[PDB]
Design a protein around this ligand. Structure first.
Ligand code: CUA
Ligand code: CUA
Ligand SMILES: [Ca+2]
Ligand SMILES: [Ca+2]
Ligand SMILES: [Cl-]
Ligand SMILES: [Cl-]
Ligand SMILES: [K+]
Ligand SMILES: [K+]
Lengths: 581, 581
């Protein structure tokens, strides 16, 4: 298969990389493994002005004060268990957020701070009949209220929560209180069930105390029950938050209607739904195994027909030292990362089930050495019923000597593996910055992007609305509006000239600058930088962007186009003149 | 020649790419073209905490308030016209800075805001006897003083200055006032001469005005005469800066003794020194030519022994539409990007010289189509007397359809070209983000990097000093110092545990957390994030990192390791308990 993309040839798949604790999303071409684009999200991007513009800061809301993010789990919206390519969602563990990226423009359009929780980690989307909810794990246990009166993790009100978000409105939909904590999560192929791993059933704070008892669990949710109760008004609220909260904790050994707890060894990590939709598969981490829950048997468990929690475990294969995550070729094989053994193991699921039932069958097919310490892995289309079994990417955390030395801080090794035949084969070592955790691949024909902006696009619709209240036609106008100590500059730009090449303000004015790029030709991007004022933004064809800063320095202040747009780019400039105190 | 670096194999050259409007430096492996490392400079990096940590904010000084940058020009320190691999220097156009990167650790360790100027653009290094000076261009004509009383560019005190920075101290050495402006810059192979291009000899603000003269110039500097006047104390100062300022403007049609103006058509851009040391080659931009100045004839120019300044023009080859930059194979050939024709033109320098003298000779050897609109280009070791004629990179501004569509905003196309033979062969298209302008390549053996940090390292030496005053040994100690409402947490880190897992503070307290990574294994990096407090940093092996934040939120707040470092990495956590006000 494939491997090389030469000049003039295009990649076959889009890859979407989490940027880890750097905070952006990266778009790659597969199988080239080249970075086609970065999409700023939780990071401040000096290039495009994400974090600086009024459009981005409005999207970010109050959290625009944060300059950091820690994002792990990128996922694409689905319709009937197949990517629809409309949105990508990603977590922020550092500042408790979920972001939405529109895949038609490759920008983040919505962001939410998840209320009453700490650290949003695991995240996956509802598969069937479409992505109605985004499900997100809050990883750390906290007091409720968290007012500094209680610090102890054991209080009746010290807990973490599972989170559902309307994928379309990006509002909170509901939250479910749970025993222990939450690591990773996945959803079934019906919409009824979701599931999550827990590694802190002990509720300790030290290393040894989290590794305490030989088993934790995966908690299985009945979204249908949860939906029913919310619409039956049976919910509580926490603090000033209107979010419906339902209780998924076990009372005195009795179950809530919303949850079930399936014991799993040992500090389990990855939580993955097979492409055939037969299994939730939990990676054992400290246990050298994975754990297979039959989704089949979940209706009987919730209905009380099953004698005991462990009954839904139809497989528990022994695999190797330090299992972290599982993915699927859609051929009936599963692929699991072993962190300690530094391998990917390929294994047959149905054979694992039968071996848990007595039959002595060798369910392991192959172990491939990786370099080194793999975390996540992802097979192409693995999260859909179209799992095509062509490509595998394992994302290792130590690169050691796989690339040229670049100092004490090392890159990550993301390795492309061909799985289209019977033997896994390593084809490409891909260095990446700041620890991507997971990634997702889509077919090229599953993504459809806009070549230039629509004037009516929601992204800057608020800026269009404000322009109205000044009597500005953004498509045509080059005006300066004065309002007390607020100066609002409106201009069109067309390579190689700004529509407004000079304005004059008085010292201390609040200057907003709105730019509308009216070039027709694709790729004709402009920038705008105000020298020595900390101001920078992109404006792409037919886009409107706006930025606001204080003219606190008297004298002549130059602004220049940052994006190379024309032969006369260097001369694409203007002057802001600031009248003294 | 080469091209593919399969798994386990290593690249041959380091590349150091500008990060453009994004503000960072990127280290790539050549010829694979993979990005090995991002070095944060003018950008805020959520991953390492550059812009957030105390060590980084100290280096940046007052400019820490700025979240943006605009770099174009990365260069490597030399000894005897050869790379010595100690330092990389780069410009910031947006906020008028010069930054230093230490190539042993791959971090920015020094940063200066250039006084009394706007927009640091062109930048190159003294070649011989070594890089004592960093030369830097200030692009924009501004009033002095810029107090808001005078705005006119024609005014006797409206001008810009050429800048010299001590490469070692990173303190201003001197500035030189010039007529017109400055675009790009380069230096000879003796240390006496430096030269810069000008496109605004007209001192205009509009587009037509800047294009009025048929010729602008390259201004040439006698650095030795300059140095001899600073020494003699024949200099002025401006405003609050101590920096010696010399006058290299013309006075009533008579030269300053520090400078010469050599008229060159038209809005010239590139300013490149051939690797044999013979020529400053200015790229003609609006004129379809390069102009070759003979560094030979310069001593006579400054000794007044030549009637006209054009007498130092020895070749002015017609090459094609929109020449922007020039590079060298060390074989006698120059290679020039044609922005409008979208080509690299290979030409023989000495034949161009023969042609200028009327001799009938075809100095053009080849034109290679590039995709699309090339700005800068770079041939391996081209800045040294060791120019090796092997690889070339052309950095084109419009990628169009060369990669998959990723929205209205496109990647740049940096195309690797094989120049080892008579024929340039296009070998790889490399999509890049936020428009790197230029780059530089060095042989693998020319870069030596630290595998781990030294405890004595200058980078965190100030943080070490604060610890001594506190009677704190960083290598061993896990104590919590209190001083009023200041709280100074000192801890060691060893995967999988922070040496301080808990600390209590009062609401409103100023918390400084100082972490020393005492793991000995290479590549074992640690991280430190405080949830919902916008705090994030990296501590690589044997490093000390510190960060400061306010505990304005009462309650329990978790802090965790961000770098996946150990099997139990998820459990590398701690607790900040904050008592109410
Ligand atoms: Cu407009 Cu560069
Ligand atoms: Cu230390 Cu992960
Ligand atoms: Ca446990
Ligand atoms: Ca001119
Ligand atoms: Cl998972
Ligand atoms: Cl140049
Ligand atoms: K790593
Ligand atoms: K571009």
């Amino acid at each position: 298969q494939k491997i090389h993309v030469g000049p003039g040839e295009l990649d076959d798949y889009y890859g979407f990389w989490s940027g880890g604790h750097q905070g952006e999303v990266r778009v790659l071409g597969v199988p080239s493994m080249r970075e086609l684009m970065r999409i700023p999200v939780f990071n401040v991007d000096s290039a495009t002005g994400w974090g600086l513009t009024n459009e981005s800061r409005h999207i970010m809301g109050d959290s625009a004060k944060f300059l950091n993010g820690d994002c792990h789990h990128p996922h694409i919206s689905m319709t009937d268990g197949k990517y629809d390519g409309k949105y990508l969602f990603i977590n922020d563990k550092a500042n408790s957020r979920v972001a939405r990226i529109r895949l038609d423009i490759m920008k983040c359009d919505k962001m939410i701070t998840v209320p009453n929780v700490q650290a949003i980690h695991g995240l996956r989307l509802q598969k069937v009949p479409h992505t109605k909810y985004v499900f997100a794990n809050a990883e750390f246990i906290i007091p409720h209220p968290n007012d500094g009166k209680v610090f102890d993790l054991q209080d009746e009100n010290s807990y973490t929560m599972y989170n559902a978000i309307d994928a379309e409105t990006m509002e909170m939909a509901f939250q479910v209180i749970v025993d222990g904590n939450l690591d990773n999560t996945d959803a079934d192929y019906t919409g009824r069930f979701a599931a999550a791993t827990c590694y802190n059933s002990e509720k300790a704070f030290d290393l040894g105390g989290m590794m305490r008892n030989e088993r934790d669990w995966v908690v299985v949710f009945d979204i249908h029950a949860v939906e029913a109760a919310v619409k039956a008004g049976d919910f509580i609220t926490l603090g000033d938050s209107k979010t419906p909260v339902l209780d998924g904790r076990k009372k005195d050994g009795k179950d809530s209607k919303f949850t079930r707890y399936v014991p799993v060894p040992k500090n389990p990590h990855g939580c993955n739904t097979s492409s055939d939709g037969k299994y939730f598969i939990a990676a054992g981490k400290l246990s050298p195994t994975c754990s297979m829950i039959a989704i089949d048997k979940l209706p009987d468990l919730f209905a009380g027909k099953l004698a005991d929690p462990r009954d839904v475990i139809v497989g528990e294969p022994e695999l190797g030292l330090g299992p972290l995550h599982t993915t699927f070729d859609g051929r009936g094989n599963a692929y699991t990362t072993l962190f300690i053994d530094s391998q990917v193991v390929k294994w047959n699921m149905e054979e694992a089930v039968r071996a848990y039932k007595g039959e002595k069958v060798n369910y392991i097919k192959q172990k491939l050495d990786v370099h080194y310490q793999p975390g996540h892995l992802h097979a192409s289309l693995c999260e859909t019923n179209e799992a095509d079994g062509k490509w595998l990417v394992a994302l290792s955390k130590f690169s050691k000597d796989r690339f040229l030395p670049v100092g004490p801080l090392h890159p990550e090794n993301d390795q492309l593996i061909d799985i289209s035949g019977d033997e896994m084969k390593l084809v490409h070592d891909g260095p990446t910055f700041a620890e991507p955790h997971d990634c997702i691949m889509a077919r090229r024909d599953q993504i459809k992007t806009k070549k230039i902006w629509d004037r009516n696009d929601p992204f800057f619709a608020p800026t269009v609305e404000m322009a109205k209240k000044d009597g500005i036609n953004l498509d045509t106008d080059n005006k300066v509006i004065r309002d007390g100590n607020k100066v609002r500059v409106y201009m069109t730009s067309m390579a190689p000239a700004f529509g407004v090449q000079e304005f004059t303000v008085k010292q201390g004015d609040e200057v907003t600058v709105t730019i509308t790029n009216i070039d027709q030709i694709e790729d004709v991007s402009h920038g705008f930088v105000v020298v020595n004022h900390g101001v920078s933004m992109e404006i792409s064809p037919q886009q409107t962007s706006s930025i606001t800063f204080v003219a606190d320095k008297p004298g002549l202040h130059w602004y220049y186009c940052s994006w190379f747009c024309h032969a006369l780019h260097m001369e694409m400039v203007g002057r802001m003149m600031v009248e003294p105190a």
